[model samples]
Target chain A: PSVFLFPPKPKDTLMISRTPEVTCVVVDVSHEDPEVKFNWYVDGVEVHNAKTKPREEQYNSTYRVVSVLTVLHQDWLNGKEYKCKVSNKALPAPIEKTISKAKGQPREPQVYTLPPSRDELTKNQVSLTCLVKGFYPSDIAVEWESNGQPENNYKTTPPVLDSDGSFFLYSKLTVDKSRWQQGNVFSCSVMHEALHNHYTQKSLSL
Target chain B: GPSVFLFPPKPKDTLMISRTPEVTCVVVDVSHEDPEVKFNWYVDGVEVHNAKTKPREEQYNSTYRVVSVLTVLHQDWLNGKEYKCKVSNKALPAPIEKTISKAKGQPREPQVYTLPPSRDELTKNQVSLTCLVKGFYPSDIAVEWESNGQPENNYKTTPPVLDSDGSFFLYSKLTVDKSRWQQGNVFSCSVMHEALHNHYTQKSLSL
Candidate 1:
C-alpha cells in the first residue's frame, strides 16, 4: 500500500498598500519524493508565467517543497480568487486549496489581576481586567461575576477596531479596598458570535 | 484618533523534544517597519537575552513586516513554565504582549476506514464510496480518490469534524461510473496529515 501525502496549503495574506497593492500566497508540501508538481491559478485561470518556482529543501526526514505567488493588490480588491494545486503520484488526487477574502476568528479571552500580587491587593483597591484582543466582527459582550452572581461594578468598552479590521475589548472590575481583604473569587465571562456555544469564561481569586 | 495595529500581533510558537529539546517563540509586527520596534523575551518572569533573536525586513507597499524570534531549551520549559514575548512600537498604546506554555503533545496519525459500498438508486450507473478518517489533530489534512490507478476528481469532502478529545474526523465521497465499478476495478481514498511523516492513510475497496 502506498502512503498518502499532501502539498502545503496556500496561505493568503493581504499586503496593505496605497499603490500596487499585492496579496502574497505561499504553498508548501512535504514528502519523501522530490518530483511533486505545482500549479497556480487566479479566478480559474492558470498562471503560466510567475517570477517564483517551487523551492525545494530537505526537512528533518523528508523533502519539503514551497512555492509563492505575489499578486496585484488591485486584483484582490476586485474580488478575485487564488488557488494552489499540488499533484504527485503518492496522492490519490490533486490536492487543492483556495484563498479568497480575509476572514476572522475570535481569540480566547485573557484574564488577569492588574497588579498581580497579594501584597498589592492588601494595599489599596484591586482591579481585574479581562483583555480580549485579536477578534473579528467588532461585536462582543463581557460580564464580571463574583461567586456566580452578576455584579454591575464592572465596565466594558465598545469593541475597538484594529488596523487589520479585527477588534479588541477591555473590561474592568474594581474591588473596594475593604472587599479586597475578603479573598473573593471573581470570574470574567465573554460572548461573541464566532465563539462556539457563544460563551467563554475565565476566573481569578485573591 | 489612535490607530490599532499589531506586529504579527499574536505570538507564534514551535515545540520539539528529542536528545536535546528546543522551543522557539516568534513575534511579528507588520504594521510598523521602523527599527524602533523592540522585542523582549521572558521565561518565568526572568528576561532572557541568550536566546537568538533575528529581525527581518519585508514590504508590500509602504507597510513593513518585522519579525523576531527566541529559541530556548526544553529542559528550561518543563513543569508548566511560562514564556512571553513583548512587542513594542511607537504607534502602540503600550507594549503588545503574548504568552505561551508547553505543548500538550504531538499529533497522532489517523485510523482510516472505508464505509460499506452503496449503489446509486436511480442511475445504477453510479456508485457512492466514502472514506472515514479518525483520531488526528491540528485539523489540517488532504483527501483524494483514485480508481484503477488513476486520480479521480469528482468528489466531495466534509470539513474536518472535531471530537471531544481534540482529535478530528473527515469524510470524502467519490461517485464513480457504474460501468467502471462493474469491471471490478479498485478504488481508494488517501489522507495526508502532519503527524504522518513520509506516510499517509490509504484505504481501498473493490466490488
Candidate 2:
C-alpha cells in the first residue's frame, strides 16, 4: 500500500527582474488537506475552479494555492516567463514555472497597485499586496495606486494560472496604516504585459 | 460481510394518531448487502432529505393534509404541540453515520415563506432576491441590506460567483443617499452562504 505524492510546490515565488512598473504575484499554498483540491493553470488555461480544499485554520499544515493576478503598463515584458501551477486530484499533476521565453503579440496591460500615500494627521490606514507576472493566455490584471496616480479600490478574489504555462497575477492593497505610517510611500507592485517588480515596505513601523 | 453502524443509528416509537389532518411518518433501517443506502432526514437541524436508498422503508417529504372549510375545527390539532423527527442510515463506502431518534411532539406544519402582496416601490432603490436552500455546502456567498433597524453602509459586496451546478452567486449593492430616502425607512435583505451556517433569503420593505 504505497500512494502518497506532493512534489510540485512554488508556494510563493518572486523574481523582481528590476523594471518596477507593476508585477505582483502572490501564490501561497502550505498544504493542510481539507480534502485537498486546488488546481490553477495558466499557459495551459484553467484559470480557477475552486478545487483546493483543507483550510479551517486551527492549524493544519499542507494545502496551498491563493492567486491575485495582474499585468499592466503595456504588460511589462522582459525575458517573460511567469508560469505557476499547483494541483490536487488525490494528488499528482501540476507545479510549474519553466521561466524564459517571450517575444511578440504582447499587450496585456491592466495593472494597478496603489495604496501608500496619505496627507495625514495621525496615520490613516494601509495594507498592500499586488503581484502580476507574465500574463500571456492568462490575463492577470491586479490594481491599486496613488501619488504615482491610479486609484480604483478594484477588489478581486479570482486569479489562478498554472498548468505548464506561466502568467501569474495578484492584488491585495489595504490603505491607511496610519497612511503608511504618516511618512507615506506605499509601493507593492508586480505587473504584466511583459514584467514589472516593486517592493517599498517604507516607513516600516509598529 | 457488509455490516455497518457508527456510534448509534437505531431508535423509534412511531405512534401517529391523527384525528385526520394528514400525518405521516415512515422509518425503516436494514442494510442487507449494501446496494445503495444514503438516506438522511432531519426537521430541526434542517436537512429535509438526502436519498440514495434501496430498502423497504424510505418515505419522507410526503406528509400532507389541509382541511379548513372555515371551522375552529377540532381546536386546531389540540393546540398543536411541537415537531421533531430524525432518520439516517447511510451506506456507501462508509464514513457518515447519523441517527437521532424521537417522535411524539404533535403539531407539524412548516414550509411557509409567503410574501407577495402586489408590493411595488422601486422608482430607484433597487431590490433583487433569490437564495434557495437545499442540502447546501460550500458556495461562498453574501448579500446584506438592513436599514432603519440600522445595518446599512450603502453596500456593494460581490465576490463569490459560481454557477454551472457547483452552486453559488453573490450580489448586493444599496447606494442610497437621498437624505436617507425622505426619512421613512424599513429595508431588509439577508443572504449569507456557505461559511458554515446562517443561510437566508429574506425580503422586507417599508420605505
Model 2 - which docking category?
incorrect
Chain A TM-score of candidate 1 vs. true chain A: 0.43
Docking level of model 1: incorrect
Can you tell me which runs of candidate 2 are displaced by over 4 Å? A1-109, A114-134, A137-170, A175-177, A180-183, A191-193, A196-206, B1-38, B43-95, B98-140, B143-207
C-alpha lDDT (0 to 100) for residue A120 of candidate 2: 20
Cα error, residue B140 of model 2, in Å, equals 4.5
CA error at residue A37 for candidate 2, angstroms = 25
- What lDDT does each candidate get? 0.56, 0.35
lDDT of 2 by residue, A85-160 (tens): 4444444654443333345464343333323222222334343434333356443334455656655543444543
| Candidate 2 chain B weakest ten by summed lDDT | B110-119
Predicted model with the maximum DockQ:
2
